[PDB]
Curated annotation (Swiss-Prot), chain A:
Name this polypeptide is given: 26S proteasome regulatory subunit RPN3
Native source organism of the sequence: Saccharomyces cerevisiae (strain ATCC 204508 / S288c)
Lineage, highest ranks first: Eukaryota, Fungi, Dikarya, Ascomycota, Saccharomycotina
Phosphoserine: residues bearing it: 369
Job of this protein: Acts as a regulatory subunit of the 26S proteasome which is involved in the ATP-dependent degradation of ubiquitinated proteins.
Additional remark text: Present with 16700 molecules/cell in log phase SD medium.
Curated annotation (Swiss-Prot), chain B:
Originating species: Saccharomyces cerevisiae (strain ATCC 204508 / S288c) (Baker's yeast)
Domain PCI: 70-230
Keyword entries, A-Z: Proteasome
Protein name: 26S proteasome regulatory subunit RPN12
UniProt keyword annotation of Cell inner membrane present: no
GO cellular component, one term: proteasome complex
From Swiss-Prot, chain C:
Family per similarity comment: Belongs to the DSS1/SEM1 family.
Gene: SEM1
Protein name: 26S proteasome complex subunit SEM1
Example GO biological process: positive regulation of transcription by RNA polymerase II
Disulfide partners: none
Organism (species): Saccharomyces cerevisiae (strain ATCC 204508 / S288c)
A GO-annotated cellular component: proteasome complex
Subunit: Part of the 26S proteasome. Associates with the nuclear pore complex (NPC)-associated TREX-2 complex and the COP9 signalosome. Interacts with CSN12 and THP3.
Length: 397, 246, 46
């Protein structure tokens, strides 16, 4: 019967990259399974396929929705099994699918109940994963390395530890060359994220952008894109660059981005109270991911916007009125906030204190003079070495 | 030894505490090789961890006045398993409630923002039962207000640490200066012209002379209460050419 | 080259042909109604 495929899959046991191909259909090889079909392996018995059939056990259970003996299985079985696979080199590639599930249910298990047995257990877990993270690191199997790394990163962020994961990266070198683009984007995802929480944005949008590029699409790969982009909007927003509407209308994902689509409406307008109200509105929704405490940083940005708009639309304004448009209590509050905005290269103004009105700087003629010469000159040179550079990297033909 | 620390902190002198710590550090080296990191999760073992917590606690509290800050971060790092291992018995000591807040505030004092927000994200999942921020709003709120740029509320918090007051007053004197330059570094570009009374108004001085003290320290030329805050074309052508004909 | 992403579940929920400028969806609707009161309010006073 259908077990022929399981035997046909064993016909993939010849050598080397076949396993790769062997995995591909094996991705969908789990469509049909039965406990009596389990007896197939009972009649089938080799170890190099023993671990694999254990994969089939995990896949069987997790899909069958029973997680108890899946993790229980992970321990009692995988540990004996784990020792045998260490000797093998090919097995490391196979185990990655294994590890991918191992952590999973355990993580998923945490959503059943709270116990410190889960703590000690997962301390053991991470400990192991770092152990043969080093072991495999010396064994030079790119794929299983990258996978494992991803799993422990995801552990740090199921935890609250960004730093430990960060300094962890500091001592990491990533198995760059030979990867699975999906794992690559899981990396770039987590990377961009933690790199953001630490308040460095300008490198986060990078790694998340790559998490958009390197990610596959299909119909299944959605949730990763949905989730990521739910982050990408946040970074784009914090950095001070409003995203365009079409970014909010793309695919099914547009139903999820809605709170962010209610943030930019709050942000672009620069109206604080509306913002805050919205944050209270969608808060719980924003907590199911951790984008929340990112978003609550925007209270700075929103006000920056408020000031910049009040500047572009007025040459000079009595402090009274700015304080009215921004709802704030006191003028004294204002000139702290505006004095701040100026230093950041936003307004380009000065402030008249004794009359208390902002005055924004003008263009002051001067075209008939030589200043345009200097300016154009700088711009010119800075165009040259662009041309230069683009011809120095050009050398390759 | 084991009673020595009791005599140090119960003594109430934190230099006696201070220099009384190093001789304890050794039995904390052996016992360190025994008690800490609590991997055994043993029930009868409760005594070791019970004492150990308070040991490092007065390690930090003492470390404050003694400028030993980083060290107790270590201690605080070392303390991390204790309050953040879930338990009712293990995580209780109010030296937590004051100590954590002390730590966050440290991070602000050093202008390390990255580490600070990282810590926020950390504490969040643990404290997630969190009610507002009870004591802990002092460092948090203290951060948010200077993030937005409204200082007056922040300074107000600096006046509001005295209720729970501890030696972070020193930190206060840190943070206080840490703010004023800001306003200074703000106002330098704000507008060129100030009456002295207004500088006093901004920088939160209770004194008129502290002003020009600061402004001299800032190199600000002062006028009687009122301060002020302040290639030929041929060449260019040939330059464009020689850039073109390379 | 296919993996399940079972770790990222697709969001579970508790339940215009023309491209838009934002100010399209500003759509604050105010002016038509506010105006009339502004006009007449003015000319009653003058």
């Amino acid at each position: 019967x259908x077990x022929x495929x399981x035997x046909x899959x064993x016909x993939x046991x010849x050598x080397x990259x076949x396993x790769x191909x062997x995995x591909x259909x094996x991705x969908x090889x789990x469509x049909x399974x039965x406990x009596x079909x389990x007896x197939x392996x009972x009649x089938x018995x080799t170890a190099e396929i023993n671990c694999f059939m254990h994969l089939l056990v995990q896949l069987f259970l997790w899909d069958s929705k029973e997680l108890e003996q899946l993790v229980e299985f992970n321990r009692k079985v995988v540990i004996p099994n784990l020792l045998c696979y260490y000797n093998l080199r090919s097995l490391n590639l196979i185990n990655a699918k294994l590890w991918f599930y191992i952590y999973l249910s355990h993580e998923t298990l945490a959503r059943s109940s709270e116990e410190i047995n889960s703590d000690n257990q997962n301390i053991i877990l991470r400990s192991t994963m770092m152990k043969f993270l080093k072991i495999a690191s010396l064994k030079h199997d790119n794929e299983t390395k990258a996978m494992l790394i991803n799993l422990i990163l995801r552990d740090f962020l199921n935890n609250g530890e960004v730093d430990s994961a960060s300094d962890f990266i500091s001592k990491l070198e990533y198995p760059h060359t030979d990867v699975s683009s999906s794992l690559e984007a899981r990396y770039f995802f987590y990377l961009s994220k933690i790199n953001a929480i630490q308040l460095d944005y300008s490198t986060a949008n990078e790694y998340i952008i790559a998490a958009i590029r390197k990610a596959p699409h299909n119909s299944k790969s959605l949730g990763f894109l949905q989730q990521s982009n739910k982050l990408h909007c946040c970074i784009q927003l914090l950095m001070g660059d409003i995203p365009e509407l079409s970014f909010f209308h793309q695919s099914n994902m547009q139903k999820s981005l809605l709170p962010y689509y209610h943030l930019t409406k709050a942000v672009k307008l620069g109206d604080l109270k509306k913002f805050t109200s919205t944050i209270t509105k969608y808060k719980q929704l924003l907590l199911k991911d951790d984008t929340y405490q990112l978003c609550v940083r925007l209270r700075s940005n929103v006000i920056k916007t408020g000031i910049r708009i009040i500047s572009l639309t007025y040459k000079k304004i009595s402090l009274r009125d700015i304080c009215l448009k921004l709802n704030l209590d006191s003028e004294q509050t204002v000139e702290y906030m505006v004095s701040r905005a100026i230093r950041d290269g936003v307004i380009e103004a000065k402030i008249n204190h004794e009359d208390g009105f902002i005055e924004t700087t003008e263009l002051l003629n001067i075209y008939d003079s030589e200043d345009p010469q200097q300016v154009f000159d700088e711009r010119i040179k800075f165009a040259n070495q662009l041309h230069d550079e683009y011809l120095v990297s050009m050398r390759y033909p | 030894l084991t009673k020595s620390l009791s005599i140090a902190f119960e003594n109430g002198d934190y230099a006696a505490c201070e220099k009384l710590l190093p001789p304890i550090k050794i039995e904390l080296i052996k016992n360190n090789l025994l008690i800490p990191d609590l991997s055994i999760q043993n029930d009868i073992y409760l005594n070791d961890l019970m004492i150990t917590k308070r040991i490092l606690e007065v390690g930090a509290l003492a470390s404050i006045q003694t400028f030993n800050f980083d060290s107790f971060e270590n201690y605080f790092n070392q303390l991390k398993p204790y309050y953040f291992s879930n338990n009712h018995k293990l995580s209780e000591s109010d030296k937590k409630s004051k100590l954590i807040s002390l730590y966050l505030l440290n991070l602000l004092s050093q202008n390390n923002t990255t580490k600070f927000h990282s810590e926020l994200q950390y504490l969040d999942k643990h404290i997630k039962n969190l009610e507002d921020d009870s004591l802990l709003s002092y460092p948090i709120k203290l951060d948010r207000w200077l993030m937005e740029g409204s200082y007056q509320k922040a300074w107000d918090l600096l006046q509001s640490g005295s209720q729970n007051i501890s030696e972070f007053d020193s930190f206060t004197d840190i943070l206080k200066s840490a703010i004023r330059d800001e306003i200074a570094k703000n106002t330098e570009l704000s507008y060129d012209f100030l009456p002295l009374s207004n500088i006093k108004a901004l920088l939160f001085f209770n004194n008129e002379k502290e002003t020009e003290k600061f402004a001299l320290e800032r190199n600000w030329p002062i006028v009687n209460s009122k301060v002020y805050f302040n290639t030929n074309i041929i060449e260019k052508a040939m330059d464009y050419a020689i850039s073109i004909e390379n | 080259e296919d993996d399940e992403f079972e770790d990222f579940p697709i969001d579970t929920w508790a339940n215009n042909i023309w491209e838009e400028n934002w100010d399209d969806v500003e759509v604050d609707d105010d002016f038509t109604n506010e105006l009339k009161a502004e006009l007449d309010r003015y000319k009653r006073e003058n």
